[PDB]
Structures are given as C-alpha cells and as structure tokens.
Amino acid sequence: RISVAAPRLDGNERDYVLECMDTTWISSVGRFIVEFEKAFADYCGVKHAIACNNGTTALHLALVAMGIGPGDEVIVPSLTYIASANSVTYCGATPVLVDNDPRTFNLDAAKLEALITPRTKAIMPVHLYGQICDMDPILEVARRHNLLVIEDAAEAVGATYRGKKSGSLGDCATFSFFGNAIITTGEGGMITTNDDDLAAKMRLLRGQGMDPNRRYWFPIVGFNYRMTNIQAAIGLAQLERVDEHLAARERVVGWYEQKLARLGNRVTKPHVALTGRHVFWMYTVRLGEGLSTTRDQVIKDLDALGIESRPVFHPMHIMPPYAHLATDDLKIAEACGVDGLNLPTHAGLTEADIDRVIAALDQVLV
C-alpha cells in the first residue's frame, strides 16, 4: 500500500515526547511551546509565531485578532480547503470568492480588483500544494485599497517567494501541522506575523482572553486554541529536520518529473512558477480532458491498485454551505476541481514507489 501522505518521525520526536511524559508537562504549559515558536519564527524569518491547536483555529484566531467581524468582507479563493472560508464565517464576516490561475491553482491577482467593495477588509491568498501565490501583484492591490493580507500557508511551510519564506509576506499568516503535512504535530497550527500588536492580541485571545496578570480576570471573550507541549515537542523535532524532509520530497518530485513523460498528454504536470521554492506538499496533475475516465474513477482505480490519491478540492461555491456565494467568474476553480489529482507525495516514497504509481496511471488513464 502506497499512502498519499505520511509523517516521517525520524528525529527527536520520540525522545522529546518521552521527555514530556517523564516530566509530566503534557498540557499547554511546557518548554517546547515557546521553543517550537521561536524556532518556527526564526525559520520563517519573522518576529513572532503563535502556536495553535490546528490550522483552522489558527485562521480563526488570526482573523478575529485582525478585527474581522460582522459586516466585513474577506476575499478568499473558491478553490481551497473549506477552513479558509469557514474561518471567515466564524467571525460573522462574508467570504468573497475569487478565481484562481489554471496552472498554479492559486488566487489570480488579476481578478481581485473588481471584487473590492466598501466592506472589504482583507485578502486571503492560499498557497496550495506548497507553492506560494504571486504575492507581488496581490500586495500592491491590497496596499492600494488599504486592505490586510492573511496568507493561508497551511500547505506551504518552507516555500519561498523572491527571497522571503511563506509566512512573512502578508500582515500575518497561518500554517497547519496535520498528520499529512510537511511538518506535523499530529494536529496543530501556527500563526506568523511581524506585527507586535497583532501578536499580543492573538496570544491574549488564544489563552481564553485572560489577563496574564490577573487569575480568572477576563477583559475580553477569547478562545481555548493553545497547542500542547507534546504537539510542540513533535513539531520542534520535525522542524529540526525540515531541510532533510524537504530534500526527501524534492527527491520524489524529481522522479515524478523524470518519469511522468511516460504518460504523454494524459496529465498536465504541475506548473512551477519561477518565484521561489515550491515545496510540493502534494504533486498535482490535471488529467487531460481527452481521457474517457473521470477523475473520481481514476481515484477508485488507483486505490484498487493499492495506491492512495486525493481529488483537488471541490470549489466552495459548488458545495451546500457556500453555494450562495457562487458567481459566473469561478470557472477555472471549477475546471480544476473536476480534473485535478494529488498524487502520493511523502518522504517515505521510493523510486520504485514512484515507478509503481506511474505504471498504475499509465494503466488507468483512459
């Protein structure tokens, strides 16, 4: 069996976790937290990193700290994982869906301007599959409208864009450390920012809105979105070998790049923009429109051959919760939801492994 993603706990994870257990610091109180944060902040080259329980709560906490609320509009790509839009909804705000680029799958900056209104407060570029959005044109449209930018970098730890790491481009950014992620904590998330004020607000809200100086004295309504010492310990040990893990994944992409040619025009290989490092959290192809099969059957057929795969997201506006947000200008997102396929991408796959997926695809793409 070839799994689509899998962690590679080949560092201090086990030992750092035993330290947690042995010292009994297993809750959201512990040394690993601030250490994983600091190390994470260094890695992104930002001033602050705020560890959360998951990528979804990281998004929600960031938005609320940014002051997003009822009446506000936040521009979000329709093609993304639902938490991007849900996080806006939790705030009482309205997601304003935008189309993406047919090759990078990312928010198409040329389509932003027209979506801007008196209620717009922020734009949420989402760096799908490990590739960062074309940030230059996005920030200049934002700057021109005095809008905030929050990167949804859930799937992009380690990616770079014109010398800056994902996480250091927008006013703030969030990451996920779910089990299939480049860096995992089992479940976990992180917000990054260089804004002191924003960081304090996030921390205050993350820790139940409690006055740090007054036990049980709460100036505002907050949340319980803290990460545990155990999650942080695993995260620390993972980031410790982030380069190694990134290398392994690049090793895999190369095989894909080297052997995909075998399928000819049957798939479109992921386009890599030349702006910085694409970390390939997943290697995603667009199946040729010529095939007779459907993307879903291919998924079935690969599974039947003992090969895991995932569909590129169903766009927000085609699903029940956000169908009310549909517009006539979300066509690339739909096209992409129909023909995209994430292929197995993880540090444990072997050349052979790849050969197997390629052979399976050669076989199933018809």
Residue (179 or 265) nearer to ligand G4M, CB: 179
Which among a copy of itself, ligand G4M, none contacts residue 194 (Cβ within 5 to 8 A by kind)?
Answer: none
Binding mask 111-140 for ligand G4M (x = CB under 6 A): ---------------x--------------
**The residue to which tokens 């429109």 are assigned:** 289
Q: What is the token pair recorded at 77? A: 């790509």
List of residues 6+ apart from 1 with CB closer than 8 A? 306, 308
Taking alpha carbons only, the member of 239, 64, 222 closest to residue 165 is 239
- Nearest approach in angstroms of CB 323 to ligand G4M is 20
Which among ligand G4M, a copy of itself, none contacts residue 120 (Cβ within 5 to 8 A by kind)?
Answer: none
Q: Is 71 exposed, middle or buried (0-12, 13-18, 19+ CB in 10 A)?
A: exposed
**The residue to which tokens 């095989």 are assigned:** 255
Residue (100 or 168) nearer to a copy of itself, CB: 100
Strands (DSSP E) contained in the chain are 48-52, 73-77, 94-98, 120-123, 148-152, 160-161, 164-165, 172-176, 189-193, 267-268, 283-287, 310-311, 340-343
When asked if residue 291 is in the footprint of ligand G4M (CB under 6 A), the reply is no
The residue range among 51-59, 118-126, 160-168, 275-283 that interacts with a copy of itself, by the rule CB under 8 A, is 51-59
Q: What is the token pair recorded at 157? A: 């730890």
Which among a copy of itself, ligand G4M, none contacts residue 323 (Cβ within 5 to 8 A by kind)?
Answer: none
When asked if residue 1 is in the footprint of a copy of itself (CB under 8 A), the reply is no
Contact 132, 252 (CB under 8 A): no
Q: Which residue among 224, 258, 294, 350 contacts ligand G4M (CB under 6 A)?
A: 224
Q: What is the token pair recorded at 36? A: 């994983």
The residue range among 133-141, 175-183, 191-199, 353-361 that interacts with a copy of itself, by the rule CB under 8 A, is 175-183
Which among a copy of itself, ligand G4M, none contacts residue 230 (Cβ within 5 to 8 A by kind)?
Answer: a copy of itself
> How far apart are alpha carbons 230 and 235 in whole angstroms?
9
> How far apart are alpha carbons 188 and 245 in whole angstroms?
18
3-state DSSP of 202-271: HHHHHECCCCCCCCCCCCCCCCECECCHHHHHHHHHHHCCHHHHHHHHHHHHHHHHHHHHHHHHHEECCC
Q: Which residue among 61, 66, 83, 253 contacts a copy of itself (CB under 8 A)?
A: 83
When asked if residue 29 is in the footprint of ligand G4M (CB under 6 A), the reply is yes
When asked if residue 100 is in the footprint of ligand G4M (CB under 6 A), the reply is no
Binding mask 88-127 for a copy of itself (x = CB under 8 A): -x--x-----------------------------------
For 343, the 3-state DSSP assignment is strand
Q: Which residue among 218, 254, 327, 351 contacts a copy of itself (CB under 8 A)?
A: 218
- Nearest approach in angstroms of CB 151 to ligand G4M is 10
CA angle 199, 89, 70 (to 5 degrees): 80
Contact 132, 276 (CB under 8 A): yes
Contact 107, 115 (CB under 8 A): no
Which among ligand G4M, a copy of itself, none contacts residue 80 (Cβ within 5 to 8 A by kind)?
Answer: ligand G4M
> How far apart are alpha carbons 304 and 61 in whole angstroms?
41
Footprint on residues 262-291 left by a copy of itself (CB under 8 A): none
Q: Which residues bind a copy of itself (CB under 8 A)?
A: 6-7, 9, 13-14, 17-18, 21-22, 24, 26-29, 53-57, 81-83, 86, 89, 92, 178-180, 184, 186-187, 208-209, 215-224, 226, 228-231, 234, 299, 310-311, 313-314, 319-321
Q: Which residues bind ligand G4M (CB under 6 A)?
A: 3-7, 24-27, 29, 54-56, 80-81, 83-84, 126, 152, 154-155, 176, 178-180, 186, 189, 224, 308, 310
